[PDB]
Design an enzyme around this catalytic site. Structure first.
Site, PDB file in Angstrom:
ATOM      1  N   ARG A 190     -12.927 -14.532 -12.177  1.00 36.17           N
ATOM      2  CA  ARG A 190     -11.820 -15.233 -11.531  1.00 36.17           C
ATOM      3  C   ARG A 190     -12.163 -16.694 -11.236  1.00 36.17           C
ATOM      4  O   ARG A 190     -13.342 -17.105 -11.288  1.00 36.17           O
ATOM      5  CB  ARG A 190     -11.366 -14.511 -10.255  1.00 36.17           C
ATOM      6  N   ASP A 240     -11.821 -10.297  -3.480  1.00 39.22           N
ATOM      7  CA  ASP A 240     -12.358 -11.552  -2.930  1.00 39.22           C
ATOM      8  C   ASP A 240     -13.612 -11.359  -2.062  1.00 39.22           C
ATOM      9  O   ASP A 240     -13.759 -11.950  -0.979  1.00 39.22           O
ATOM     10  CB  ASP A 240     -11.254 -12.265  -2.136  1.00 39.22           C
ATOM     11  N   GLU A 288      -4.398 -23.490  -1.026  1.00 38.86           N
ATOM     12  CA  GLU A 288      -5.075 -24.133  -2.117  1.00 38.86           C
ATOM     13  C   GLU A 288      -4.190 -25.280  -2.592  1.00 38.86           C
ATOM     14  O   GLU A 288      -2.949 -25.205  -2.531  1.00 38.86           O
ATOM     15  CB  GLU A 288      -5.362 -23.132  -3.247  1.00 38.86           C
ATOM     16  N   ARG A 290      -0.244 -25.073  -2.852  1.00 39.62           N
ATOM     17  CA  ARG A 290       0.272 -23.706  -2.924  1.00 39.62           C
ATOM     18  C   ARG A 290       0.939 -23.339  -1.613  1.00 39.62           C
ATOM     19  O   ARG A 290       0.384 -23.575  -0.533  1.00 39.62           O
ATOM     20  CB  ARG A 290      -0.852 -22.717  -3.279  1.00 39.62           C
TER      21      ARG A 290
HETATM   22  C1  LIG Z   1     -11.814 -17.211  -0.353  1.00 38.99           C
HETATM   23  C2  LIG Z   1     -10.756 -16.292  -0.901  1.00 38.99           C
HETATM   24  O1  LIG Z   1     -10.562 -15.190  -0.390  1.00 38.99           O
HETATM   25  N1  LIG Z   1     -10.061 -16.780  -1.941  1.00 38.99           N
HETATM   26  C3  LIG Z   1      -8.979 -16.068  -2.637  1.00 38.99           C
HETATM   27  C4  LIG Z   1      -7.556 -16.413  -2.133  1.00 38.99           C
HETATM   28  C5  LIG Z   1      -7.347 -16.201  -0.619  1.00 38.99           C
HETATM   29  O2  LIG Z   1      -7.667 -14.841  -0.237  1.00 38.99           O
HETATM   30  C6  LIG Z   1      -5.929 -16.571  -0.139  1.00 38.99           C
HETATM   31  O3  LIG Z   1      -5.587 -17.941  -0.455  1.00 38.99           O
HETATM   32  C7  LIG Z   1      -5.792 -16.321   1.362  1.00 38.99           C
HETATM   33  O4  LIG Z   1      -4.445 -16.597   1.755  1.00 38.99           O
HETATM   34  O5  LIG Z   1      -6.512 -15.735  -2.875  1.00 38.99           O
HETATM   35  C8  LIG Z   1      -6.763 -14.994  -4.093  1.00 38.99           C
HETATM   36  O6  LIG Z   1      -6.959 -13.627  -3.746  1.00 38.99           O
HETATM   37  C9  LIG Z   1      -5.489 -15.020  -4.945  1.00 38.99           C
HETATM   38  O7  LIG Z   1      -4.372 -15.278  -4.402  1.00 38.99           O
HETATM   39  O8  LIG Z   1      -5.574 -14.757  -6.172  1.00 38.99           O
HETATM   40  C10 LIG Z   1      -8.018 -15.448  -4.878  1.00 38.99           C
HETATM   41  C11 LIG Z   1      -8.966 -16.398  -4.127  1.00 38.99           C
HETATM   42  O9  LIG Z   1     -10.297 -16.397  -4.683  1.00 38.99           O
END
Ligand SMILES: CC(=O)N[C@H]1[C@H]([C@H](O)[C@H](O)CO)O[C@@](O)(C(=O)O)C[C@@H]1O
Ligand SMILES: CC(=O)N[C@H]1[C@H]([C@H](O)[C@H](O)CO)O[C@@](O)(C(=O)O)C[C@@H]1O
Ligand SMILES: [Cl-]
Ligand SMILES: [Cl-]
Lengths: 471, 470
Positions: B26, B51, B326, B342
């Protein structure tokens, strides 16, 4: 062994103002100076008894150990907003003082809260407004301008600067000259007075400070007779997470032994944005190791505290019963610092620090011998003779009534045993400030009302050891 | 005009590990270096697509504009807790990177999140644990010992000091040496390894760091072939009120014009303790003005923002719809900084900074011409003919599907006029990172699955002006 009351600050009666136009006095602080002078501090609450409005930080002085008292000296009295729709909330606020003298420099300190115009701790903005900006090392107070997002700043000589750092022709009175410093915060465009940065409604100037909780200090180098202009110490001690930060009113201490001897300790308490007054009030001290020049925040009693098998932090907690609020502070002869804290357990709670008030030991000692009706208390260190003791005074209850003086022995261990508990004021009784007067005598300034008096009248009694021993 | 995809990081199939024993890749970042090299970075998610877990930060290099690719280089891979009851949550976590090169020193930076062992952003401790302490001018990382209230400190040489300031017989690996720096945080007594300060369960050593959200940085001075040990940048940028602070993944920028020329900008976002991930996610940037030596937090877009008649602040807000997470950052020729965030509005949210990303103008511009399905995006500056443009790539929808490349003209005042919207990948489409290649052609590394691939496989495509202009 116990004198009749002497009223030091008399409130009006039956909801009307007294002779001086003042409805109410609250929040006593009592200080015995090196010259043996007694200083009695109070909030002069002109319009009503509530925790806001037009309030002066005032003292009276006694040069004969509490018999007679001079004229009221006003330390700070910020001017009201003359255009305010409701004058009851129509003033920048000062509230709650702590007094302390530096034994070395002889300088006397009054530290007190400040809020811009509105309802004080019950009228704080629900969202954060940044109050200070660090620009190239230097910290400046921010100003917000009507209809603009950016942060203006108050820089040298009070010159207002734009968000991108250009001098304007706006000036803030940062060096107030008027009696009680009522001109503090006045906003000028060159030579014209437009308004005041502490005004928040019906403003006649473009600029206001953040709607936040501030901490101010004023000092006296002549035994309480005259006072410096207010010094804004907030940015030294207030973290970005802190919502309210305010004093635990009464009289602070200077550490007399150990490696931190000379350190000035001032009880304060904070709230957070998670639960504010509902579940986050947390005692701590701020302190100074340079005779009141700079100040630092110690950690909260609640920081990394174990409660119901789970850890809390002052910055994030939401626990009504784990709150500790206004506090009074004592150093023992073995170097330790005890913090006796207003709280919601129905009895006394006491924290101990072994590093001069910077951090606190894991457990809060509770003492069911001393009730706590959730009201301020004061406590001092005393020798008798030469066995170590602590005197503590607060409301006996069931409500804010029946004022008690409590006596504890301090065991050579650091522990405390409660011995004697004696009524000192029947009827209404709330905040109070104890002081050692010398030769086995003790002074107390306290809140009481009778014969229809507005909350409160502040009265003074003396007592000796024989009063303390009654059982 | 549009090449077919080259898979750069291949995920397993049908819920199973790939041939390297990796279920998932990812979070693409794509970096075109000064030498012409393409650096494709990713989260190498060994055990599952979620994550958290055992994740390495990895890159591959291409020297022929994306035609062939070298072997994976692992930037950082913290070792798992060998005693964890559930290995799927039994590792300290690195997650989400941003790549950028300093155009002057040529240094390449990878900035990424770090959490101790647990469920990442989804397993953050309810109450604050202080992570750092300043003692006599120096900031030290804190350690907690079972059954003790006080803060131990990691000081010079990694020696652990007691709450009251005495040296102990314990030390931490503060200068890791193993491949991928998998020894970082190892807790020794003498020459006996006892455990790891990032382990949070079934511990064999006495000490752990605060269970919090951290931001790490590693750098390359050799076009991405080798990497420094991780540098903990957290204390430079994370305020006491912040709960989460993490990157907006992809490729950051260096400012090329104006008073702040040379500033490195990295998109990040925070949560607060009032409403965490439900109502507080707030975009901003961190930045460096001295070539990545020291870092500073800008203000949040949400700081003193007016929302439905009322001011909010990123530290206090509880407003699901006013969140922005993000983001991707672009500097215009007129010197403005645009931040595409986002969000939860269905369309593109754009903030503007006039002071090199430190503070943001009062309005967030919504552009209904570009759909946002609540998913990450990338956007780059480009000169053609040379008129000034921005290319933005994200999913077209209605879900995480149908990848698009968007062309906007940037007007002299910084307004965006969207010219063209051209699909680049049917079916699965999530995170992506865009780069300028030279001709101009444009590279895109993205997430997409076909043929039962686990979320996600990360594939690369080139495309030119005439593909955009369609
Ligand atoms: C540090 C972390 O967890 N990053 C993750 C985020 C956050 O969980 C959200 O932005 C929280 O709102 O979202 C993802 O799951 C997603 O949407 O594909 C992937 C990403 O790597
Ligand atoms: C700054 C301020 O408001 N101080 C006031 C506090 C706080 O309101 C409470 O401690 C909040 O919990 O309490 C009083 O109302 C009270 O109990 O008589 C009086 C005091 O002046
Ligand atoms: Cl005004
Ligand atoms: Cl361990």
């Amino acid at each position: 062994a116990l004198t009749e009351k002497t009223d030091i600050f008399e409130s009006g009666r039956n909801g009307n103002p007294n002779k001086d136009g003042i409805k109410s006095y609250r929040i006593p602080a009592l200080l015995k100076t090196d010259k043996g002078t007694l200083i009695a501090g109070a909030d002069e609450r002109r319009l009503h008894s509530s925790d806001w409005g037009d309030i002066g930080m005032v003292i009276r002085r006694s040069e004969d150990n509490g018999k007679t008292w001079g004229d009221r000296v006003t330390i700070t009295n910020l001017r009201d907003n003359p255009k305010a729709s409701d004058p009851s909330i129509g003033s920048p606020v000062n509230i709650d003082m702590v007094l302390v003298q530096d034994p070395e420099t002889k300088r006397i300190f009054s530290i007190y809260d400040m809020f811009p115009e509105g309802k004080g701790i019950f009228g704080m903005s629900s969202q954060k407004e940044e109050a200070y900006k660090k620009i190239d090392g230097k910290t400046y107070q921010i100003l917000y301008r009507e209809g603009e997002k950016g942060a203006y700043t108050i820089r040298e000589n009070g010159t207002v600067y734009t968000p991108d750092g250009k001098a304007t022709d706006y000036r803030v009175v940062v060096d107030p000259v008027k009696p009680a410093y009522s001109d503090k915060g006045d906003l000028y465009k060159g030579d014209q007075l437009l308004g005041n940065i502490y005004f928040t409604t019906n403003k006649t100037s473009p600029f206001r400070i953040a709607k936040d909780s501030y901490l101010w200090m004023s000092y006296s180098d002549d035994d309480g007779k005259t006072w410096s202009a207010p010094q804004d110490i907030t940015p030294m001690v207030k973290a970005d997470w802190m919502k309210f930060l305010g004093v635990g009113p009464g009289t602070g201490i200077v550490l007399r032994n150990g490696p931190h001897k000379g350190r000035i300790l001032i009880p304060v308490y904070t709230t957070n944005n998670v639960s504010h007054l509902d579940g986050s009030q947390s005692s701590r001290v701020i302190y100074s190791d340079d005779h009141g020049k700079t100040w630092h925040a110690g950690e909260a009693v609640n920081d990394n505290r174990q409660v119901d098998g789970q850890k809390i932090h002052s910055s994030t907690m939401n626990n009504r019963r784990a709150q500790n609020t206004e506090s009074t502070v004592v150093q023992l002869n073995n170097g330790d610092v005890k913090l006796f804290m207003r709280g919601l357990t129905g009895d006394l709670q006491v924290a101990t620090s072994k590093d001069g008030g910077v951090t606190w030991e894991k457990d809060i000692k509770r003492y069911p011998q001393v009730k706590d009706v959730y009201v301020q208390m004061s406590a001092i260190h005393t020798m008798h003779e030469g066995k170590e003791y602590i005197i503590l005074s607060n409301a006996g209850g069931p409500k804010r009534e029946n004022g008690m003086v409590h006596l504890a022995r301090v065991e050579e261990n650091g522990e405390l045993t409660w011995l004697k508990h004696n009524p000192i004021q029947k009827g209404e009784f709330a905040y109070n400030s104890l002081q050692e007067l010398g030769n086995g005598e003790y002074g107390i300034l306290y809140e009481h009302t009778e014969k229809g008096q507005n909350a409160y009248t502040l009265s003074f009694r003396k007592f000796n050891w024989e009063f303390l021993s009654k059982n």
